[PDB]
Amino acid sequence: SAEDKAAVERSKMIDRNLREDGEKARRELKLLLLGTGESGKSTFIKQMRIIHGAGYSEEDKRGFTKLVYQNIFTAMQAMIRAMETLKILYKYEQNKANALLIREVDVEKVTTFEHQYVSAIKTLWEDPGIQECYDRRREYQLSDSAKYYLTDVDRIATLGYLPTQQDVLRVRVPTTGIIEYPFDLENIIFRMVDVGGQRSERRKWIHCFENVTSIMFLVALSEYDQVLVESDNENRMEESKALFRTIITYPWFQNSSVILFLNKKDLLEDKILYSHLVDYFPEFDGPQRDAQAAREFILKMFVDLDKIIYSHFTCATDTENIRFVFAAVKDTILQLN
Amino acid sequence: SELDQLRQEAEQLKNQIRDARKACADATLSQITNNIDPVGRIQMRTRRTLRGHLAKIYAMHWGTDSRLLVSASQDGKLIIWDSYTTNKVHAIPLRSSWVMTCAYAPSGNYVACGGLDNICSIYNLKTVRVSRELAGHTGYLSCCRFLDDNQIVTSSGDTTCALWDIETGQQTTTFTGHTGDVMSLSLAPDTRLFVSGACDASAKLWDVREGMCRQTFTGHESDINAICFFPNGNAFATGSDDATCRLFDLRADQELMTYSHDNIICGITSVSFSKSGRLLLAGYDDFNCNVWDALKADRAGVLAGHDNRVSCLGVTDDGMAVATGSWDSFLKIWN
Amino acid sequence: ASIAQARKLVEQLKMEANIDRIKVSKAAADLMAYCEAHAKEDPLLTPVPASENPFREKKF
Ligand SMILES: Nc1nc2c(ncn2[C@@H]2O[C@H](COP(=O)(O)OP(=O)(O)O)[C@@H](O)[C@H]2O)c(=O)[nH]1
Ligand SMILES: [Cl-]
Ligand SMILES: [Zn+2]
User: Fold this and answer.
1) Which of A70, A172, A230, B131 has the fewest CB neighbours in a 10 Å radius?
2) What are phi and psi of B137, to 5 degrees?
3) According to the UniProt entry, which residues carry N-acetylserine (chain B)?
C-alpha cells in the first residue's frame, strides 16, 4: 500500500528526530538546586542568566516592576505584624492609620505604587519603632532585601522607574511550579532546576530527580542565630543541615555530585559584629566578631555527618563572585562527568 | 464554643453515616460470589514492544479506536503510536519534560499532558501545535481526561480538581474538598460523575455539572495513586501505596473488597478493569502487573515484562488489549 | 475563619448522610450479574479467535 509505505516512512522520520534529540539530551547536565526558603536559589538562577544567558534587557526589567512593589508591601506587612507580635510601639500616632492601610493591601493584586501608599510606607519606615523592629528581625521572617528596597523607595516610586539589575536580582518571583533555567556553556547544556516554589507532597515527585548530575545545596550563613520556636528551639541552620543530611543519604542521589554553597557571606560579615555564634553553638571556640572563624565553623559543622562534599562560600547577589565560584564548580562537575 | 458545637455535630454526622452504612451491610461480596467459578489462570503474551522513549514513561492513554495510544516520558516527548503496526504517528516535543499525565481526546483530534509545570497543555493533532495552555492550578497536574474537544477535567497536587472550558482557558468549576494532593481521576461511563483519589487517603465522587462532592470513601490511611470506574458506573477501584487495591460500591456507599498478597508490599501506580469488569489489573513498583478476579479477590495472573516500575496501564475500549508503560522506557501490549 | 470551614464540613456531612443506600447483597448481586452478562464480550477473560485478534493477525 502507498499509504502503508508512507506511514512507515513517517515513523522512520520520527525515529530520526528522536535519535537526534537523544544525542542532544546526552549533552545535558541537570543541576538541582536545593535548600530552605531564602537560601539563595532563585538569585543563583538569575545570575546564570546574567553570566551565561541572555541577561536582562530594558524590556525584561520593565516586566519585574510590579514585583518590586510587591516585595515592598510584603516586607512592610511583615514588620507591621511583628510590631504587634513583639509589642513594639510606634513613635508617630499617624502610623496607626498608615499600618492599617498597608496591612489591608492585597499584595497579589498590586500593579501600581500610588502616592497614598508611598507616603504611608515612607512614614512607617522612618518611625524609630519600625527601625527597632527591623533590628529584631532574627525573631521573625523578613526578606534580606527589605532594607534595600525601603532605603530606595524614592527611586522606586518615581514616575518612569525602571528596575536595575540589582533590583531584579533581589526581587521575589512568585511561582508554585517547577523552575527550570537551561543555558549553554562549552557545548554542554546546563539545566538548572529549582523546586522550592512547590508546596505539594515531595514524596510524590522526588523520584523525578533520580540520578541528577549534581545537587547544589544552598545555606544562608546568616541564619545561625535563628531558632524554630515550633521545633523545640531547633536552630534554623540545624534544620537546613538536617535537610542536607536527608539529601546526601537519599539512595537515588548517591551518584550525584554534591556542592554545598554557604551563601550570604556578606550578611555574616555584618551580623557577626553583634550576634555571637557561641550563644547558639556553644561548642564554637573561635574569637567573637570574626567572620572567617564563624564561616569555617559553620562549614565544618554542616558536613559533620564515604561521599565527597564540595563546598564554596558565596554571595549570590554579587555577579562577580558567582562568576568566579561557578567557573570553578563547572570545572569540577565536568571533570566528574 | 460555636466551633466546639460544630466540631461535635460533625462527629454526630460521621457516626450517622457509619451507622447507615452498617445497616446496609447485610452480606459481603465474597459471600455473594462464593459459588461462581474461578476465572482460572490468565496468561497473556507480549504482542508488541513499543520502543522509542529514552527515559522513564510516566503515563499513557488509549484512543477510543483501540488502536492509537499516547505516552508521556521524562525524555520530554509525547509519542502517539499505532499499536497494530508499532508505527510512530507523532512525536511532540514538550516545553516541560516534568510530565506526570497524558490523555487522548475521544475524538482523536487532541491530546493533553502536564506535570510539575502545573499546566494542562492541549495539542492539536489535525493542524502538531500547542493549542492551549490551561493555567490555574497551584500545584502539579497529576491526571487529566477530556469530556469532549472543548472540556477537560484535571486533578492537582494543589488538592483540587477542575473542569475547564478549553476555548476560554478558564476553570468552569473547581472541585474542592480533598485535604491532600489529588493523584488520579476517572470519568463515569455516562460522564455525569467522576471519582478522584488523593493523598488524604480518600476517594471522592463528584457531580460534574453541579460541582459538589456527593460521597467520600476512606482508603485506610494510604495514598491513593490510581482510580478507575467499574464499567456499569456503579462502583470503582483504587490502587494505593500500601500494595492494596480496593473496590467501592456507590449505591451501597462503602468498600466491598480488597485485593492484596502479604508478600507484595510495594506501591500500586495504576488500575483498570477489563471490559466486563471481571478482571482488575494493577501496575506495581515491583515491575509487574497483577491481574485480580474482581468478584472473588484471587490473583488470576501476572504480566512480567518490565525491568523497572510499571507506571501506567490501560485497557482498550474494545477490550482486546492491555498496555503497560514503564520506568524502563518501554510500553508493552498484551493479550 | 475556622467557624466557616467547620460549617462547610457539617453541611457536606449532611449531604453525604442524607442519600439513598441499597443493601450490599443487592449491590454485589448486580455487579456479579453485570460480569456474567458481559463475559462473552470480554477478550481478556474469554479468548477471541486469532483471526479476530488484531495483535495476532499477520496482516500487521
Ligand atoms: N545580601 C545578600 N542577599 C542575598 C544573597 N543571596 C540571596 N540574597 C537575597 O535574599 C533574598 C532571598 O534569596 P532567594 O535567592 O530568593 O532565595 P530562595 O528562596 O532560595 O530562592 C533575595 O532578595 C535575594 O536577592 C547574598 O548572598 N547576599
Ligand atoms: Cl565544586
Ligand atoms: Zn569546588
Assistant:
1) A230
2) -60, 150
3) 1
Q: What are phi and psi of B112, to 5 degrees?
A: -135, 155
- Give the one of B82, B119, B157 whose C-beta lies nearest to A204's C-beta: B157
Place of cell 533590583: A167
Which chains neighbour C (Cβ–Cβ under 8 Å, 3 or more pairs)? Answer: B
CA B11: distance to chain centroid? 31
Q: Do B75 and A11 touch (CB under 8 A)?
A: no
Taking each helix axis from N to C terminus, what angle separates A65-85 and A94-103, rounded to the nearest 10 degrees? 120
CATH number of C1-60: 4.10.260.10
Mutate which of A11, A17, A200, A202 to disrupt the B interface (most B C-beta within 10 Å)?
Answer: A200
Domains for chain A: give ranges and CATH numbers: 31-56+175-336 (3.40.50.300), 65-162 (1.10.400.10)
Pairing label, strands A309-313, A257-263: parallel
Beta bridge partners of residue A219, listed in sequence order: A262
Full domain range(s) for residue B16: 4-335
CATH number of the domain encompassing residue B91? 2.130.10.10
Distance (Å, whole) CA C19 – CA C6: 21
Method: X-ray
Q: Look-up: residue for cell 469532549?
A: B148
**In Å, what resolution does this model reach?**
1.4
Q: In what order do the strands lie in the sheet with B235-240?
A: B224-229, B235-240, B245-249, B254-259
Q: Smallest CA–CA separation between A41 and chain B, in Å?
A: 18
Rounded CA-CA distance B314/C40 in Å is 20
Looking at the CA of A312, which ligand is closest?
3
Q: Domains in chain B: how many in total? A: 1
Residue tagged 478493569 (cell numbers): B273
Residue of the CA atom closest to atom 14 of ligand 1? A40
Tell me the CA–centroid distance for residue A330 and ligand 2, in Å. Answer: 7
In angstroms, how far is the first alpha carbon of chain A from the final one?
A: 48
* Catalytic residue check, A108: no
